Amino acid sequence: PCVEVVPNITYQCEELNFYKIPDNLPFSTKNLDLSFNPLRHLGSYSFFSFPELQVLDLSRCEIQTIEDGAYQSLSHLSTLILTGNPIQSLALGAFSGLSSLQKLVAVETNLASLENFPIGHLKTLKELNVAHNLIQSFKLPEYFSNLTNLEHLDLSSNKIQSIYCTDLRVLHQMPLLNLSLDLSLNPMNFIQPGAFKEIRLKELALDTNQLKSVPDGIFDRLTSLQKIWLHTNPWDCSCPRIDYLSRWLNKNSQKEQGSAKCSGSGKPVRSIICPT
Ligand SMILES: *[C@@H]1O[C@H](CO)[C@@H](O[C@@H]2O[C@H](CO)[C@@H](O[C@@H]3O[C@H](CO)[C@@H](O)[C@H](O)[C@@H]3O)[C@H](O)[C@H]2NC(C)=O)[C@H](O)[C@H]1NC(C)=O
Numbered sequence: 001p002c003v004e005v006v007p008n009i010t011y012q013c014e015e016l017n018f019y020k021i022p023d024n025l026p027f028s029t030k031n032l033d034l035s036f037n038p039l040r041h042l043g044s045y046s047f048f049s050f051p052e053l054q055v056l057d058l059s060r061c062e063i064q065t066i067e068d069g070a071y072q073s074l075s076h077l078s079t080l081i082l083t084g085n086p087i088q089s090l091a092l093g094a095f096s097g098l099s100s101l102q103k104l105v106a107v108e109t110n111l112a113s114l115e116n117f118p119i120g121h122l123k124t125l126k127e128l129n130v131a132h133n134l135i136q137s138f139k140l141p142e143y144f145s146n147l148t149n150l151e152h153l154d155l156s157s158n159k160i161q162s163i164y165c166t167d168l169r170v171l172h173q174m175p176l177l178n179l180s181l182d183l184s185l186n187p188m189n190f191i192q193p194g195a196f197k198e199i200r201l202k203e204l205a206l207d208t209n210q211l212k213s214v215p216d217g218i219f220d221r222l223t224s225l226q227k228i229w230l231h232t233n234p235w236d237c238s239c240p241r242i243d244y245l246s247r248w249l250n251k252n253s254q255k256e257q258g259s260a261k262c263s264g265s266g267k268p269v270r271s272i273i274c275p276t
């Protein structure tokens, strides 16, 4: 049926027209690629014959629902990819048993909020990619206080329009060493003052949004910052509004990735010098 890539270790089962998890596979399998298969639903213990799973790819499997305890057995799974599944229902315990999950990829899974996302138990989670979804709020649920290992959070291409100070409230009780935050390609046109106060970010992606200006000293408390994207935004370079950001981008050209340009001229924000 599938295609053995690594004996008793890795197999390729995509494009085979499967509706159920294959059984004619070594119970030692570590990596399984079940992508592009009409699984439709995932009941409890859907992966029982795979106690040795570390990587599971379920991308585009027409999955509509994941019941409670779907991966209950997979206790050694570190990477789970669910990209492209039209999830119309996610059980409270859908991710029960995943006590070693480090990477959860849920791009394009009709995710509308992070509140009803049963991941508050995956304390080992390091990377959460929920890009290309319907998330409208950047309000990080309280359960994010237990994900003390998260270093990558990709919320790009969603429906976030603002960034309030309360949004990152949770990130003050952990801590979180090197957290790379992507919020690019969002209908974002507003950021609230000090929204990143007492916050420690290594990378910040805010490019290709709807930003015309940002609060003064918005990036004051941020010495852990190594990279930042702000390019492709309708920056208003009228002074003294663009004063703070022009000075900052110029005095931090190394960090900045790409180039934030003025709207109506194309001039780099870092080049603008506001008169006192
Ligand atoms: C892939 O997994 C298979 C099992 O599904 C491995 O083959 C099996 O290897 C064991 C050895 O650990 C064999 O069991 C017994 O081994 C002793 C050696 O002391 C021997 O005296 C017995 O006669 C018996 O062979 C078992 O028969 C064998 N089964 C198969 C599939 O033929 C295999 O080693 C794994 N692939 C690798 C990493 O080589």
Ligand SMILES: *[C@@H]1O[C@H](CO)[C@@H](O)[C@H](O)[C@H]1NC(C)=O
Pocket (backbone or CB within 6 Å): 120, 121, 123, 146
């Ligand atoms: C935090 O996450 C842990 C994971 O073991 C869970 O038991 C707990 O309910 C969550 N909230 C609390 C009480 O800290």
